[PDB]
């Protein structure tokens, strides 16, 4: 979906019953952030406590 | 810089593997890790490899003590693949806690704990 057809909601939704709380989507977002989003392999190194926190900032 | 970036960002790359791509990713990781530990031994290099090991075990405990089924499974098979003091003790304690807290993940955790006890 190339980073915009996939999420389509995270930008429009930004945490009880949101979309960044589901692993079955968070896993695929991490599988999609691998092929694209050059800021993925970027040396952030800020120790984000939870994957939803890291994932929302990368959208 | 390449070795730095490979040893730092280990977390999400490990989390995003389909249960055997974690094996194929741990293979290359252990290969370059044994390369580093081979031509490692030299004081500054000792400090930088200490920092690498520290960041690696920190990411490991961070991914183990939380980060449900996919993360723990991938990091378990990876830690098994890269198996060949305080950091080791902390990792072993966290792995034992995760194992006792528990199916197949428990078997993998017990196998990894046994391998660590043998390689103690």
Swiss-Prot record, chain A:
Tissue specificity note: Ubiquitous. Expressed in various cancer cell lines. Expressed at very low levels in normal breast epithelial cells and highly expressed in breast tumors. Expression is strongly associated with an aggressive phenotype of breast tumors and expression correlates with tumor size and the metastatic state of the tumor progression.
Q: What induces it?
A: Up-regulated during cell proliferation.
- Superkingdom of origin organism: Eukaryota
Q: Reproduce the UniProt comment on modification after translation.
A: Expression is altered specifically during apoptosis and is accompanied by the appearance of novel forms with smaller apparent molecular mass.
The signal sequence is none
**Quaternary structure (record):** Component of the THO subcomplex, which is composed of THOC1, THOC2, THOC3, THOC5, THOC6 and THOC7. The THO subcomplex interacts with DDX39B to form the THO-DDX39B complex which multimerizes into a 28-subunit tetrameric assembly. Component of the transcription/export (TREX) complex at least composed of ALYREF/THOC4, DDX39B, SARNP/CIP29, CHTOP and the THO subcomplex; in the complex interacts with THOC2, THOC5 and THOC7. TREX seems to have a dynamic structure involving ATP-dependent remodeling. Binds to the hypophosphorylated form of RB1. Interacts with RNA polymerase II. Interacts with LUZP4.
Q: Which disease is it linked to?
A: Deafness, autosomal dominant, 86: A form of non-syndromic, sensorineural hearing loss. Sensorineural hearing loss results from damage to the neural receptors of the inner ear, the nerve pathways to the brain, or the area of the brain that receives sound information. DFNA86 is characterized by progressive, bilateral hearing loss that is most predominant in the high frequencies, begins mildly during the fourth decade and gradually progresses to severe-to-profound deafness in the seventh and eighth decades.
What job does the chain carry out?
A: Component of the THO subcomplex of the TREX complex which is thought to couple mRNA transcription, processing and nuclear export, and which specifically associates with spliced mRNA and not with unspliced pre-mRNA. Required for efficient export of polyadenylated RNA. The THOC1-THOC2-THOC3 core complex alone is sufficient to bind export factor NXF1-NXT1 and promote ATPase activity of DDX39B/UAP56.
Entry similarity comment: Belongs to the THOC1 family.
What name is this protein filed under? THO complex subunit 1
Q: Which organism is it from?
A: Homo sapiens
Curated annotation (Swiss-Prot), chain B:
**Compartment list:** Nucleus; Nucleus speckle; Cytoplasm
Effect on the protein upon substituting residue 60 to L: In MRXSK; uncertain significance; does not affect nuclear and cytoplasmic localization
Could you list the residue ranges that cross the membrane? none
Please tell me, according to the UniProt entry, what happens when changing residue 73 to G: In MRXSK; uncertain significance
Organ and tissue specificity: Expressed in the hippocampus and the cerebral cortex.
- The domain of life is Eukaryota
* Subunit relationships: Component of the THO subcomplex, which is composed of THOC1, THOC2, THOC3, THOC5, THOC6 and THOC7. The THO subcomplex interacts with DDX39B to form the THO-DDX39B complex which multimerizes into a 28-subunit tetrameric assembly. Component of the transcription/export (TREX) complex at least composed of ALYREF/THOC4, DDX39B, SARNP/CIP29, CHTOP and the THO subcomplex; in the complex interacts with THOC1, THOC3, THOC5, THOC7 and DDX39B. TREX seems to have a dynamic structure involving ATP-dependent remodeling. Interacts with POLDIP3 and ZC3H11A.
Instruction: Say which family it is in.
Output: Belongs to the THOC2 family.
Q: What does this protein do?
A: Component of the THO subcomplex of the TREX complex which is thought to couple mRNA transcription, processing and nuclear export, and which specifically associates with spliced mRNA and not with unspliced pre-mRNA. Required for efficient export of polyadenylated RNA and spliced mRNA. The THOC1-THOC2-THOC3 core complex alone is sufficient to bind export factor NXF1-NXT1 and promote ATPase activity of DDX39B; in the complex THOC2 is the only component that directly interacts with DDX39B. (Microbial infection) The TREX complex is essential for the export of Kaposi's sarcoma-associated herpesvirus (KSHV) intronless mRNAs and infectious virus production.
Question: What disease is associated with this protein?
Answer: Intellectual developmental disorder, X-linked, syndromic, Kumar type: A form of intellectual disability, a disorder characterized by significantly below average general intellectual functioning associated with impairments in adaptive behavior and manifested during the developmental period. Intellectual deficiency is the only primary symptom of non-syndromic X-linked forms, while syndromic forms present with associated physical, neurological and/or psychiatric manifestations. MRXSK patients manifest variable degrees of intellectual disability.
Name of the molecule in the record: THO complex subunit 2
Tell me the organism: Homo sapiens
Gene symbol here is THOC2
């Amino acid at each position: 979906p190339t980073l915009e057809e996939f999420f389509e909601e995270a930008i429009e939704q930004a945490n009880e019953y949101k979309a960044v709380n589901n692993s079955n989507y968070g896993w695929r977002a991490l599988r999609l952030l691998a092929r694209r989003s050059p800021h993925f392999f970027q040396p952030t190194n800020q120790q984000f406590k939870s994957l939803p926190e890291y994932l929302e900032n990368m959208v | 810089l390449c070795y730095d970036r490979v040893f730092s960002d280990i977390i999400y790359t490990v989390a995003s593997c389909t249960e055997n791509e974690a094996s194929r990713y741990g293979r290359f990781l252990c290969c370059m890790l044994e390369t580093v530990t081979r031509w490692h031994s030299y004081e500054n290099f000792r400090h930088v490899v200490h920092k690498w090991h520290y960041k690696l075990t920190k990411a490991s405990v961070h991914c183990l003590e939380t980060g449900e089924y996919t993360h723990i499974r991938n990091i378990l098979i990876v830690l098994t693949k890269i198996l060949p003091v305080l950091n080791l003790g902390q990792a072993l304690e966290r792995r034992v806690h995760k194992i006792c807290q528990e199916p197949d993940l428990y078997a993998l955790a017990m196998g990894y704990s046994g391998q660590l006890k043998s390689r103690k």
